[PDB]
Amino acid sequence: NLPEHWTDMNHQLFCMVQLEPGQSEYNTIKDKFTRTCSSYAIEKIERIQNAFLWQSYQVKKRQMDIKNDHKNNERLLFHGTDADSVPYVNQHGFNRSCNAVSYGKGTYFAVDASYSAKDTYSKPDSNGRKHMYVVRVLTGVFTKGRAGLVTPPPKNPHNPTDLFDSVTNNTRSPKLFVVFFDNQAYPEYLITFTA
Amino acid sequence: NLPEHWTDMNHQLFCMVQLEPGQSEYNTIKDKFTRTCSSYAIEKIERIQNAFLWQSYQVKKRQMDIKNDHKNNERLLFHGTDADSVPYVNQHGFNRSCAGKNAVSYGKGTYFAVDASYSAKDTYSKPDSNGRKHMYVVRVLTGVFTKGRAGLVTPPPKNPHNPTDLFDSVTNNTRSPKLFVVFFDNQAYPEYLITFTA
Numbered sequence: 243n244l245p246e247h248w249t250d251m252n253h254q255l256f257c258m259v260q261l262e263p264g265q266s267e268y269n270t271i272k273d274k275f276t277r278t279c280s281s282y283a284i285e286k287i288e289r290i291q292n293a294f295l296w297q298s299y300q301v302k303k304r305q306m307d308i309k310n311d312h313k314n315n316e317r318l319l320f321h322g323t324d325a326d327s328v329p330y331v332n333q334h335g336f337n338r339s340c341n342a343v344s345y346g347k348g349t350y351f352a353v354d355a356s357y358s359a360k361d362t363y364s365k366p367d368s369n370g371r372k373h374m375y376v377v378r379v380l381t382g383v384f385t386k387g388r389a390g391l392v393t394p395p396p397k398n399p400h401n402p403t404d405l406f407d408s409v410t411n412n413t414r415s416p417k418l419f420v421v422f423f424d425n426q427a428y429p430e431y432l433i434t435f436t437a
Numbered sequence: 438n439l440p441e442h443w444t445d446m447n448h449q450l451f452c453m454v455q456l457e458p459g460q461s462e463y464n465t466i467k468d469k470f471t472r473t474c475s476s477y478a479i480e481k482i483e484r485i486q487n488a489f490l491w492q493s494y495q496v497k498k499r500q501m502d503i504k505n506d507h508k509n510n511e512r513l514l515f516h517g518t519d520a521d522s523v524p525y526v527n528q529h530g531f532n533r534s535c536a537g538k539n540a541v542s543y544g545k546g547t548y549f550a551v552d553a554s555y556s557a558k559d560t561y562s563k564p565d566s567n568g569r570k571h572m573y574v575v576r577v578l579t580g581v582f583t584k585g586r587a588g589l590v591t592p593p594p595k596n597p598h599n600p601t602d603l604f605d606s607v608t609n610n611t612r613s614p615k616l617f618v619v620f621f622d623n624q625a626y627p628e629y630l631i632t633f634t635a
């Protein structure tokens with residue numbers, strides 16, 4: 243059930259598609275980035291077409307929509323990484339088993355591109371190029387995190403296996419989210435940029 | 438896609454079903470266990486009906502079946518655990534982030550045994566305060582595997598010049614496998630829970 247806006251993949255299951263500057267899709271993703279990163283230089287934006295990762299993510303989304311008895315479980319967030327991790331993320335997505343982890347041992351995603359644009363996250367490569375993903379994240383119902391969590395806390399410790407979907411730094415005004423399970427995050431676009 | 442011989446769960450997403458001795462389904466599990474654990478006695482065997490874990494597992498199996506083309510990717514293995522872990526595994530499956538270091542480590546992941554005798558060690562199936570020991574029978578997507586190494590946090594690449602094309606799992610010995618380690622969520626479906634005693 244591959245999305246309409248994907249382009250044909252000649253019966254293959256993985257491809258990175260470079261977006262055409264000035265078209266609707268490129269403009270929308272560029273705007274999300276330049277909202278906080280207007281001083282950077284965008285080299286290119288690529289659409290990640292990973293059939294298997296999409297499949298696994300959409301199953302978790304359908305499950306969370308049933309569990310939570312509503313949609314609104316999804317947010318678009320940013321994730322900066324080093325060049326040597328980009329092939330892994332494109333093919334396999336995010337892995338908690340692979341920086342500060344103050345809110346738990348999961349994968350971190352930022353509300354603002356400016357945060358992911360820090361050199362500690364989007365490490366500039368031997369040519370000055372920096373890499374940041376635009377990510378579909380199943381944040382669902384969330385609570386404040388804490389150091390040492392390996393899963394989100396329970397919603398009520400009377401039922402210890404019924405968990406929050408994610409954690410955050412601040413529930414009223416979140417700036418980061420942490421997810422603790424594979425296929426809770428789909429890397430949708432890769433931005434290559436310089437300072 | 439739920440299997441047609443499961444009990445009707447009446448819109449519920451999760452149920453444990455107590456099996457009857459003398460049914461083929463009970464007897465095959467009892468025989469698989471007693472092949473190496475004849476000194477122990479089974480209290481009960483429960484079929485685990487977890488709709489969401491099943492869906493996510495069967496998606497991964499279909500993907501590995503496509504990618505590997507005509508491999509037997511699935512093995513039926515054992516996993517001993519403590520009573521405190523049983524409610525989490527029943528609902529959420531096998532989480533590598535909660536796994537202990539194994540006495541012989543072939544990587545940082547969830548361990549599954551070929552022989553029930555391995556899982557029956559008190560180190561894994563810790564007796565509870567009533568002397569009950571707990572062991573899962575698990576469908577595991579072992580896929581294409583190689584000998585593991587203690588450093589691993591994912592299976593190793595098949596080819597060092599293509600680091601993202603991975604083995605599906607690792608083992609202690611490729612010629613005579615006795616354990617498998619998996620490093621990803623929804624690569625193992627907890628199918629039965631054996632409760633047993635000395």
Ligand SMILES: O=C1N=NC(=O)c2cc(OCc3cccs3)ccc21
Nearest residue numbers: 321322341342343344350352358363
């Ligand atoms: O874009 C990111 N890429 N990798 C990260 O590890 C990461 C981590 C991150 O917040 C980590 C914390 C800050 C304060 C306390 S905990 C934010 C963004 C990213």
